[PDB]
Amino acid sequence: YFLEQTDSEIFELIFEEYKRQNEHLEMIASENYTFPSVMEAMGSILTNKYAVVDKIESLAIERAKKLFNCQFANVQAHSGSQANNAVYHALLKPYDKILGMDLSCVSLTGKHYQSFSYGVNLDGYIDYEEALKIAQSVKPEIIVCGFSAYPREIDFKKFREIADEVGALLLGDIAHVAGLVVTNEHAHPFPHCHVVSSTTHKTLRGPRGGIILTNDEEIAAKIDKAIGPLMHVIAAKAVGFKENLKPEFKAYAKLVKSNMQVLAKALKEKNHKLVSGGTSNHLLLMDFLDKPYSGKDADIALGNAGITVNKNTIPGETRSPFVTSGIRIGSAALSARGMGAKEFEIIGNKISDILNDINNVSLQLHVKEELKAMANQFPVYQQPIF
Amino acid sequence: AYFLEQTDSEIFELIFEEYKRQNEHLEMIASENYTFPSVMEAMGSILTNKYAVDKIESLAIERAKKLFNCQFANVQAHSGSQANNAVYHALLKPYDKILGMDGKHYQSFSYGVNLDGYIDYEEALKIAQSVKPEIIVCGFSAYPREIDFKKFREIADEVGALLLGDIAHVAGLVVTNEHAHPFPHCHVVSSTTHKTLRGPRGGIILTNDEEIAAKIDKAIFGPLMHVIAAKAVGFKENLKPEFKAYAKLVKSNMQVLAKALKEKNHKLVSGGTSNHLLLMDFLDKPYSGKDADIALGNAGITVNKNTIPGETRSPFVTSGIRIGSAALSARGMGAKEFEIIGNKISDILNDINNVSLQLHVKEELKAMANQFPVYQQPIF
Prior knowledge:
Chain A: (6S)-5,6,7,8-tetrahydrofolate binds at residues 103, 218, 320-322. Chain A: It holds the Pfam family SHMT. The structure is a homodimer. Chain A is an alpha/beta fold. In chain A, 45% of the residues lie in helices and 14% in strands. Chain A contains 15 helices and 14 strands. In chain A, helix 8 (178-181) links the parallel strand 7 (169-173) and strand 8 (195-199).
């Protein structure tokens, strides 16, 4: 209750963000609402500690090993991106080659690496035969899989078959589907991957941060060497992991997926096209190649109606990368608010109504009022500070 | 607080145990402190959900400009260490030379203190004239006197060097005009936001040069809005008259401590202090700094061993201890307490193997600590 009295300007900014989170429909596939108990840990007196291993870090590691079903965890990475870079820094030599995904049909981090891409077929699925052919030619030291805008499951087993044929390490970046992995609602990356990286936020609903997992003791030792401990953040990760182990979190992961199925079905019944024909996870991609509006146009129109999505290039893209021909839409945040099939059906029909009359501003403003009323039936938080 | 107490008793117990630890021992490590409660409230806010330049970042920057009396601020560094590194990365090229106090390949050179414990500025000038460093760094974590930023800029100007002032260890004294200011002498200034500023764990880089500011911004460029808000909250607290009183108390408690120790005939590096810390000198005593560290720790007084000028023992053993007043001053302790503490420190040092005495002192100081609670809750 201090800020309410001691810092009017910060309190106003927090309160307006709290109101914004509560009153609009967050459908950016990477966004989510952290658990209240995670924020309590983030705001705890553990921030004063330390300006061989704290019990709190051992507990975070123990819970991670159980949650991710692996023998070793490092919980010190500040982000999923730092987690990936620490893996490269630990396992690669200068000018080693990295083969990773992009959604199409030289780089430094202290050390210089050579970067290569594989992609999707014209139907929007990873082309594993072509990824193998690229690997055979490129001969990468490490193959990475996992991708922020892919609406289907990663076949880690097949990627390991490729990695084994060319003698590559395999890194599974599960940052974008982690809450589905740890609830057995997405194919598991182990034992196929030599090493796995993830964020702790997004579909896991923990604090902002990264993590690195492995079953190989020598990889684990190298990771520990390549990576100031923030004890409140490590505690917050541990808090999130214990929430993630509960049966309620499996029910949440199933709702994330079923809400996506409801949304996909509603859109396809209104004759909208989806990349790959639908989804098997937390996100879909709408396909506007044959529409007179762009992904950017749709992003803005839906945003005016209180629905946040993001534009996204799609396979066969014919528009510029700043404009794009698609939008990415996710269910994780609204599912965390308790919204379900009835709500996702209404949202699908409203998205269809706007895309079918995309410059009708009064329609957008009408929809915004209706969906704000829906949001207020499913409040996110009863307070802005925990 | 509520949720964790019900939903995760194991983590809640660990928080409570650490809350008791903070309250029950006398924290005198010069770099430790207790963050403002309002800063932890920002840290535990819903701002963590934003973005998986914001008005929150602009407010943090504007408050930093006012607080540090400068034209530009970058508030993104995650630590004092990252802040220094970003300065080097932004302003230096490989094999450039860095003169500081004792794929980039920066080459490091050192100046030191005379045997009286003061920075030797004549020798630092001689070294700079010969080596011609591209950058000079000043500020130091175990130095009990004020940095002469003006003299360092005279040296840097002689050789055409940049001057970085690392104020991480004295920042709360600087911004209250209780320590010489680094500007306009320094081209660039780095600091932590915790320690004597009592904000969150984090870093900051300040400058008055637009070109340097542009390079800093490119060099450090995931924004953690709860952390940036927390820095902003701390800076506003640092601007209050209450915070200048706190800085004066930090310094006056250190004077009380040094006076008490010297009057019991203990020796101090440079004979005293002008800031938040002192160094005790055990070169002529049969016990080591490690001995003193352990013995005082067993009495509930937390210090750290530290090498001193003329060190003759192993660097893992040392002939001194570093003692600071910032954390106990933040709990509200004053001269009466620091006189008692100085006396008990003396009693233990004069009988360093009396373990019964250490345990007896620990119980005695428990009542004093209980009089000055750090906080009234473990979660904000």
